[PDB]
Amino acid sequence: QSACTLQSETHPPLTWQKCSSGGTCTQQTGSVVIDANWRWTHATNSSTNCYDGNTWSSTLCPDNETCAKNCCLDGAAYASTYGVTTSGNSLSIDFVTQSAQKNVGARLYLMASDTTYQEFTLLGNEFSFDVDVSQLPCGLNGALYFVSMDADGGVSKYPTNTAGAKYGTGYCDSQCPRDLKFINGQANVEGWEPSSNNANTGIGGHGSCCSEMNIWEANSISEALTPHPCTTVGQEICEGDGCGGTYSDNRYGGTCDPDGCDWNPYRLGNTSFYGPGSSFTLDTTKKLTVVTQFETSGAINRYYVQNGVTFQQPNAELGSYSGNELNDDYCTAEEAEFGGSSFSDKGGLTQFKKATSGGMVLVMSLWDDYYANMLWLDSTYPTNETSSTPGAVRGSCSTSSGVPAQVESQSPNAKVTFSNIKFGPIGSTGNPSG
Numbered sequence: 299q300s301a302c303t304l305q306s307e308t309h310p311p312l313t314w315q316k317c318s319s320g321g322t323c324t325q326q327t328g329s330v331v332i333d334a335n336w337r338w339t340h341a342t343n344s345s346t347n348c349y350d351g352n353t354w355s356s357t358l359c360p361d362n363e364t365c366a367k368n369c370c371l372d373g374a375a376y377a378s379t380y381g382v383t384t385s386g387n388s389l390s391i392d393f394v395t396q397s398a399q400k401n402v403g404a405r406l407y408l409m410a411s412d413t414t415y416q417e418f419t420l421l422g423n424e425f426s427f428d429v430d431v432s433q434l435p436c437g438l439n440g441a442l443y444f445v446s447m448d449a450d451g452g453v454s455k456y457p458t459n460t461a462g463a464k465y466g467t468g469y470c471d472s473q474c475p476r477d478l479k480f481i482n483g484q485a486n487v488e489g490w491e492p493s494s495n496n497a498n499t500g501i502g503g504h505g506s507c508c509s510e511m512n513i514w515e516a517n518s519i520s521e522a523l524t525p526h527p528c529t530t531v532g533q534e535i536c537e538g539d540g541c542g543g544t545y546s547d548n549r550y551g552g553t554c555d556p557d558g559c560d561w562n563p564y565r566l567g568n569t570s571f572y573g574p575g576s577s578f579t580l581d582t583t584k585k586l587t588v589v590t591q592f593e594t595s596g597a598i599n600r601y602y603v604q605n606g607v608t609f610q611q612p613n614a615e616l617g618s619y620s621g622n623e624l625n626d627d628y629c630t631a632e633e634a635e636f637g638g639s640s641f642s643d644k645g646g647l648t649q650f651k652k653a654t655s656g657g658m659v660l661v662m663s664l665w666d667d668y669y670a671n672m673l674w675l676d677s678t679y680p681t682n683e684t685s686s687t688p689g690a691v692r693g694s695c696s697t698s699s700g701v702p703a704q705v706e707s708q709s710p711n712a713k714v715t716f717s718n719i720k721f722g723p724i725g726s727t728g729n730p731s732g
């Protein structure tokens with residue numbers, strides 16, 4: 299796709315801190331850009347929509363190439379249309395925003411400049427951020443994660459894409475999303491199937507895969523940390539059911555691991571650690587700090603800070619594993635106790651180290667789940683399972699919670715606030731901000 303200028307594109311500013319081993323942190327100035335899928339896609343020479351509702355224009359978009367040549371992406375009014383606002387080192391995302399149309403959530407990327415994404419090399423470093431999930435009920439997911447996207451949004455690899463990072467192009471993740479309207483400089487009109495439960499989305503014949511580090515997926519009820527390796531580290535297009543993931547038929551037939559080696563304190567047995575109220579170690583009605591460390595061995599560590607008190611990731615006992623570190627032993631025991639082989643089949647933490655050794659883009663979003671109602675995060679899943687089944691219970695939400703249409707109309711004011719992002723070598727982010 300190309301870019302049009304009927305509506306100006308002004309990326310809301312966002313500062314963050316970069317720390318060093320010497321004990322100092324310095325303020326960095328960046329900005330955020332919304333994903334291309336949320337943008338107005340129309341004819342380059344007119345205001346005629348190339349995509350409307352959940353269907354493409356059969357005249358403007360008869361095939362993937364013609365569509366990309368005839369269509370462009372336009373600017374976004376962050377606050378008024380998407381409910382996205384920033385203030386200093388803070389970023390807030392509103393769940394539902396009503397303007398000329400109804401918007402639900404957003405997916406944003408941190409930029410290094412007006413035309414490029416900020417890349418982070420996680421291995422040997424730690425990432426810290428503050429979050430307020432008090433306004434996120436069952437069925438919602440305020441996420442902060444990393445994906446192996448290109449810094450230019452794919453422009454150098456695919457000439458027909460001239461919008462680039464400035465317009466939020468180039469997305470990819472471990473589920474090889476087929477709901478993307480534009481992939482590899484082309485439209486995803488071929489093989490398009492409108493959603494039977496979502497009037498604004500569909501599934502195309504191609505997907506976009508890449509490694510994904512889900513540092514934070516959570517609401518006021520549950521939270522999970524999950525690395526997802528792929529046989530191909532960076533962005534790569536996939537075709538049809540060969541994509542695997544949520545959008546396809548065979549979930550494990552692709553090059554990426556859609557499940558991951560997840561760590562959910564509640565799912566592992568500690569049901570009093572994270573929840574809303576003073577009866578929980580971490581009170582989700584109040585802001586908290588989340589620190590994630592990527593050691594060179596490939597293992598991941600995590601600690602939290604609330605009201606000045608530090609809490610390491612709670613201890614878990616699973617099979618022959620015991621500890622609070624996400625490592626090979628944990629992931630192996632999880633597959634043995636909870637079932638599955640996807641993570642290990644994709645190389646495990648060793649293959650994942652290849653992703654963290656390279657650059658990854660920071661993503662921040664808020665979404666509801668049209669495929670599984672977020673039950674996999676905060677409820678019993680599958681819903682037919684019981685509590686006696688190892689790993690079935692992941693949260694206290696009812697198995698009837700998370701219906702998109704219901705949460706969107708009942709909790710439109712829901713929102714998430716991410717702030718005070720700090721990045722640097724392990725042991726450095728707790729030092730004085732500059």
Ligand SMILES: *[C@@H]1O[C@H](CO)[C@@H](O)[C@H](O)[C@H]1NC(C)=O
Pocket residue numbers: 567568569570571579609610611612613
């Ligand atoms: C849950 O984790 C917290 C913090 O590590 C700990 O104090 C508490 O004893 C744990 N509770 C259970 C039931 O494991």
Ligand SMILES: [Ca+2]
Pocket residue numbers: 471472473510
């Ligand atoms: Ca994902």
Ligand SMILES: [Ca+2]
Pocket residue numbers: 593595597623
């Ligand atoms: Ca270690």
